[PDB]
């Protein structure tokens, strides 16, 4: 797709040039060494002062034909405990749904920005996982020490 290459190049060019500290986003590889902008590996700080802090969570974005179309679908690897990340790791945010708030002007640094948002507020209203979101709602203090264990476990 020359329409989605075109952007992924100026994303990769624009990420390169100015990203936020901690941050990773990263193209993958084909099969034959070569550049693969469809798929990459990224990797998400936790928040300084959260919970989450310490914590860099790994995920990947793949990106269909017609990006900027739709969204990519970004996909904690492996999955992380959070009311609003289904248990195959994918993540539920209006900006990544076509026909909620994702517009094709959105940067992939606006996409792990966002997602970081997500990861220190969750949204009550469109759970994704039953357990963290239970918890969530039944005991503050359990589920951050929850998401604690689990920055701790993601330390670099
Ligand atoms: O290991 C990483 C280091 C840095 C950024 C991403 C990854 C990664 C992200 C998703 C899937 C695999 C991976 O290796």
Same mark, same amino acid.
């Given at each position: 797709?020359?329409? !989605?290459?075109?952007?992924?190049?100026?994303? #990769?060019? !624009?990420?390169?040039?100015?990203? +936020? $500290?901690? $941050?990773?986003?990263?193209? @993958?590889?084909?099969? /034959?060494? @070569?550049?693969? %902008?469809?798929?990459? =590996?990224?990797?998400?700080?936790?928040? &300084?002062? @959260?919970?989450?802090?310490?914590?860099?969570?790994?995920?990947?974005?793949?990106?269909? /034909?017609?990006?900027?179309?739709?969204? +990519?679908?970004?996909? $904690?690897?492996?999955? %992380?405990?959070?009311?609003?990340?289904?248990?195959?790791?994918?993540?539920?945010?209006?900006? %990544? =749904?076509?026909?909620? /708030?994702? #517009?094709? &002007?959105? @940067?992939?640094?606006?996409?792990?920005?966002?997602? *970081? =948002?997500? %990861?220190?507020?969750?949204?009550?209203?469109?759970? &994704? *996982? !039953?357990?963290?979101?239970?918890?969530?709602?039944?005991? #503050?203090?359990?589920? =951050?020490?929850?998401?604690?264990? *689990?920055?701790?476990? $993601? &330390?670099?």
């Amino acid at each position: 797709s020359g329409i !989605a290459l075109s952007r992924l190049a100026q994303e #990769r060019k !624009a990420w390169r040039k100015d990203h +936020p $500290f901690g $941050f990773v986003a990263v193209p @993958t590889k084909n099969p /034959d060494g @070569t550049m693969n %902008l469809m798929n990459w =590996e990224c990797a998400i700080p936790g928040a &300084a002062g @959260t919970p989450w802090a310490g914590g860099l969570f790994k995920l990947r974005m793949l990106f269909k /034909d017609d990006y900027p179309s739709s969204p +990519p679908k970004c996909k $904690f690897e492996p999955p %992380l405990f959070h009311p609003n990340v289904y248990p195959s790791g994918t993540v539920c945010l209006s900006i %990544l =749904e076509e026909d909620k /708030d994702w #517009r094709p &002007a959105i @940067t992939i640094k606006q996409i792990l920005l966002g997602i *970081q =948002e997500l %990861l220190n507020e969750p949204n009550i209203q469109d759970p &994704a *996982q !039953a357990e963290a979101y239970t918890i969530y709602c039944q005991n #503050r203090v359990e589920y =951050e020490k929850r998401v604690r264990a *689990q920055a701790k476990k $993601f &330390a670099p």
